[PDB]
Amino acid sequence: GLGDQVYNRLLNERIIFLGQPVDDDIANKITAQLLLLASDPEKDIYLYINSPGGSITAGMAIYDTMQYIKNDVVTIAMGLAAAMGQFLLSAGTPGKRFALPNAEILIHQPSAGLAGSASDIKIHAERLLHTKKRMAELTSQHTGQTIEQITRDSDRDRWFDAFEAKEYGLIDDVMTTAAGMP
């Protein structure tokens, strides 16, 4: 009731909220909203991220859609931006990635559950390794760090403050008041 109404009134101003674990449904909704807002190709889109992570394919779909449209996408980190949500936050257009002063950013490596015969398990393990390598490459591309350091740090979780994230390259600026957002 109230939530749908306030979210519609916010979407009327080109603002998208991603505030739950990333599964197929939420990724489908975010892709639909981005495609809908892509009708006007000269106005930017703001995405607010407070998520603990989620699935890999759904996040890949969201990332591809973000890189697909002509409109620039401004990513804002509020609260928690962990696991693949961090990847989506770092995937915004350069110069337009921000985080609030008391936000937490976490870097993680993929996890999966496998069951079947040895050949099927071999195939799925190879695919999981390929997915991990792809995520490492994309993170290295988006933050500017070398692919070696990202591998080392993603090994076991690494938590980052706003200023630490800005120094690392995950975000571009830390905002305090409303003068900073474009």
């Binding site: 490596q109 993929p110 996890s111 069951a115 015969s117 040895a118 050949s119 071999k122 393990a125 991990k132």
Partner: protein
């Protein structure tokens, strides 16, 4: 209990799924029979669909470790892990009943939730163990390693005469 009475006639049963407890019981029985005079054979009857694999290996090297011969008799069915133990008896002393069925196939597992590194390590161990089981089965049979690799990829089911021809058993007994 008839099981103890048959124990006095050095007869051991494997009639359940292979697990840690059953494997422990089987090795305890084998060690107890070995502690007796080492000049009498041990007869083991197998009717099992398989089970845990490390427990199977424990039973296997327990049989390979003791001095007296172990005679394996197929019964009802001997599938997967049970087939490995049936073919592990001493040469010339592996037998099957006329209406028993034998099945062989590759190991199955479920590498649980973990990081990429953990899944890599577990999958490497699983591939190693599949190779080890295939080599072990190749040594106990007349067939080469490549043929055993080819025939294990899917489920293959053999009868008594087919098992005799293939090499999983030595003879099929119809009467005493």
């Amino acid at each position: 209990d008839p099981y103890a009475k048959l124990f006095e006639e050095r007869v051991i049963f494997l009639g359940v799924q292979i697990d840690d407890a059953s494997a422990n019981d089987v090795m305890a029985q084998l060690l107890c029979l070995e502690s007796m005079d080492p000049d009498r054979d041990i007869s083991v009857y197998i009717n099992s669909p398989g089970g845990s694999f490390t427990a199977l290996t424990a039973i296997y090297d327990t049989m390979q470790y003791v001095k007296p011969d172990v005679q394996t008799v197929c019964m009802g069915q001997a599938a997967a892990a049970a087939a490995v133990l049936l073919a592990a008896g001493t040469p010339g002393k592996r037998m099957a009943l006329p209406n028993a069925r034998v099945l062989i196939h590759q190991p199955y597992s479920e590498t649980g939730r973990g990081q990429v590194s953990d899944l890599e390590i577990a999958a490497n161990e699983i591939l190693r163990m599949r190779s080890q089981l295939e080599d072990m089965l190749a040594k106990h049979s007349t067939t080469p390693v490549e043929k055993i690799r080819e025939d294990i990829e899917r489920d293959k089911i053999l009868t008594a005469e087919d098992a005799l021809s293939y090499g999983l058993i030595d003879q099929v007994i119809s009467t005493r």
